[PDB]
Amino acid sequence: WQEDPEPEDENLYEKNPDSHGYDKDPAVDIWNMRVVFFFGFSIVLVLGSTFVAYLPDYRMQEWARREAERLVKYREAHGLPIMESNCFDPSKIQLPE
Amino acid sequence: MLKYIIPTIMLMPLTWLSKNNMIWVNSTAHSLLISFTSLLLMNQFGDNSLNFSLLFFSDSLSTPLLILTMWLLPLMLMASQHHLSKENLTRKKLFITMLISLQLFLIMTFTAMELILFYILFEATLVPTLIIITRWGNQTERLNAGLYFLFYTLAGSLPLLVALIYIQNTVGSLNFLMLQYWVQPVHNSWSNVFMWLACMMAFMVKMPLYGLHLWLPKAHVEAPIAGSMVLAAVLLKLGGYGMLRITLILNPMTDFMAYPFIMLSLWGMIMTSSICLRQTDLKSLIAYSSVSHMALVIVAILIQTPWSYMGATALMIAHGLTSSMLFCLANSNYERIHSRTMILARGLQTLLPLMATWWLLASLTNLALPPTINLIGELFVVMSTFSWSNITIILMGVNMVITALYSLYMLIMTQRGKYTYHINNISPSFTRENALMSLHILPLLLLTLNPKIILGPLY
Amino acid sequence: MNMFSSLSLVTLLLLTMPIMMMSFNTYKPSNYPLYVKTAISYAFITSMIPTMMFIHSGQELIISNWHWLTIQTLKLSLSFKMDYFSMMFIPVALFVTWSIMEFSMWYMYSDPNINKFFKYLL
Amino acid sequence: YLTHQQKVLRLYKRALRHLESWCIHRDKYRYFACLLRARFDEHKNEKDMVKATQLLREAEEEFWHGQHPQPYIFPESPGGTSYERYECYKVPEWCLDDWHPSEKAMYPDYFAKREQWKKLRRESWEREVKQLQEETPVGGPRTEALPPARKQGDLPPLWWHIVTRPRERPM
Amino acid sequence: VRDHWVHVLVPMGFVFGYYLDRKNDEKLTAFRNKSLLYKRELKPNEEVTWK
Amino acid sequence: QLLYITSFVFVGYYLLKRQDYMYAVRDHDMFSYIKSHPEDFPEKDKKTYGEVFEEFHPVR
Amino acid sequence: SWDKDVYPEPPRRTPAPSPQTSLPNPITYLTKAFDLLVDRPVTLVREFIERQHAKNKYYYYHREFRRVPDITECQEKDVLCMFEAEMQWRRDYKVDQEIVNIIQERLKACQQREGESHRQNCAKELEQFTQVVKAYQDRYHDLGAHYSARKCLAKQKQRMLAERKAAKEA
Amino acid sequence: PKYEASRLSSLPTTLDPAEYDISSETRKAQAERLAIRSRLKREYQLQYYDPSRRGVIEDPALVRWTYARSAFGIGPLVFWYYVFKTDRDRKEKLIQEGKLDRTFNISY
Ligand SMILES: CCCCCCCCCCCCO[C@@H]1O[C@H](CO)[C@@H](O[C@H]2O[C@H](CO)[C@@H](O)[C@H](O)[C@H]2O)[C@H](O)[C@H]1O
Ligand SMILES: CCCCCCCCCCCCO[C@@H]1O[C@H](CO)[C@@H](O[C@H]2O[C@H](CO)[C@@H](O)[C@H](O)[C@H]2O)[C@H](O)[C@H]1O
Ligand SMILES: CCCCCCCCCCCCO[C@@H]1O[C@H](CO)[C@@H](O[C@H]2O[C@H](CO)[C@@H](O)[C@H](O)[C@H]2O)[C@H](O)[C@H]1O
CB D62 within 8 A of CB D144: no
Chains A and B lie in contact, requiring 3 or more CB pairs less than 8 Å apart? yes
Please give the Cα distance from A74 to F59 (Å, whole number): 33
Per the entry, the structure determination technique was: cryo-EM
Give the residue, by CA position, lying nearest to ligand 1 atom 15.
B17
Select from B129, B4, B95 the least CA-distant residue to B56.
B4
CB E37 within 8 A of CB G68: yes
Please give the Cα distance from B286 to B276 (Å, whole number): 8
Select from H60, H66, H76 the least CA-distant residue to B285.
H66
Optimal mutation site among F46, F56, F57, F59, interface G, most CBs of chain G within 10 A:
F56
A71·G99 Cβ contact <8 A: yes
For residue B56, give how far its alpha carbon lies from the nearest alpha carbon of chain H (Å).
31
Beta bridge mates, B281: B341
Select from B322, B364, B344 the least CA-distant residue to B426.
B344
Rg (CA), chain E: 18
E10·B34 Cβ contact <8 A: yes
My answer on whether omega of the bond before C33 falls inside 30° of 0, hence cis, is no
**Around Cβ B399, how many Cβ atoms within 10 Å?**
23
User: Does the C-beta of B188 come closer than 6 Å to ligand 2?
Assistant: yes
Q: At what angle do helices G79-114 and G149-168 cross, to 10 degrees?
A: 70
- Compute the distance from residue B119 Cα to the ligand 2 centre, in Å: 29
CB D170 within 8 A of CB D90: yes
G102·A63 Cβ contact <8 A: no
- Compute the distance from residue B75 Cα to the ligand 3 centre, in Å: 22
Nearest CB neighbour to G135, from listed A67, A70, A84: A84
Please give the Cα distance from D127 to B328 (Å, whole number): 44
Give the ligand whose atoms come closest to the C-alpha of residue B256.
2
How far is Cα of residue B37 from the mean position of the Cα atoms in its chain?
22
Residue B369 CB partners (closer than 8 Å, separation 6+): B375
Give the ligand whose atoms come closest to the C-alpha of residue F6.
1
- Compute the distance from residue A49 Cα to the ligand 3 centre, in Å: 29
Handedness of CA A54, A55, A61, A64 (dihedral sign): positive
Please give the Cα distance from H93 to D29 (Å, whole number): 76
B387·F59 Cβ contact <8 A: no
- Compute the distance from residue B255 Cα to the ligand 2 centre, in Å: 14
Please give the Cα distance from G79 to B28 (Å, whole number): 44
User: Does the C-beta of B193 come closer than 6 Å to ligand 2?
Assistant: yes
Phi, psi of G35 (to 5 degrees): -65, -45
Please give the Cα distance from B51 to B44 (Å, whole number): 10
For residue E6, give how far its alpha carbon lies from the nearest alpha carbon of chain G (Å).
44
**Residue A14 at interface with chain D, using a CB cutoff of 8 Å:** no
Q: Which amino acid is at H56?
A: V
For residue B72, give how far its alpha carbon lies from the nearest alpha carbon of chain C (Å).
27
Query: C72 burial class (0-12, 13-18, 19+ CB within 10 angstroms)?
Result: buried
CB B54 within 8 A of CB B113: yes
Instruction: Kindly identify which residue of chain G lies nearest to residue B387, measuring between CA atoms.
Output: G142
Please give the Cα distance from H39 to H45 (Å, whole number): 10
For residue B389, give how far its alpha carbon lies from the nearest alpha carbon of chain C (Å).
21
**Around Cβ G144, how many Cβ atoms within 10 Å?**
23
B181·G87 Cβ contact <8 A: no
CB C14 within 8 A of CB C43: yes
Please give the Cα distance from H61 to H83 (Å, whole number): 46
CB D144 within 8 A of CB H37: yes
Between chain D and chain H, how many beta carbons pairs sit less than 8 Å apart? Answer: 54
Select from B389, B211, B193, B301 the least CA-distant residue to H77.
B211
Select from B96, B125, B130 the least CA-distant residue to B13.
B96
B306·C69 Cβ contact <8 A: no
Q: At what angle do helices C32-57 and C114-121 cross, to 10 degrees?
A: 20
**Around Cβ D38, how many Cβ atoms within 10 Å?**
9
For residue B36, give how far its alpha carbon lies from the nearest alpha carbon of chain A (Å).
5
Q: Which residues of F touch H97 (CB under 8 A)?
A: none
Measured from the Cα of B90, ligand 1's closest atom is 25
Please give the Cα distance from B139 to B146 (Å, whole number): 12
H35·D1 Cβ contact <8 A: no
Residue C8 CB partners (closer than 8 Å, separation 6+): C47, C50, C63, C80, C82
Handedness of CA G68, G71, G74, G78 (dihedral sign): positive
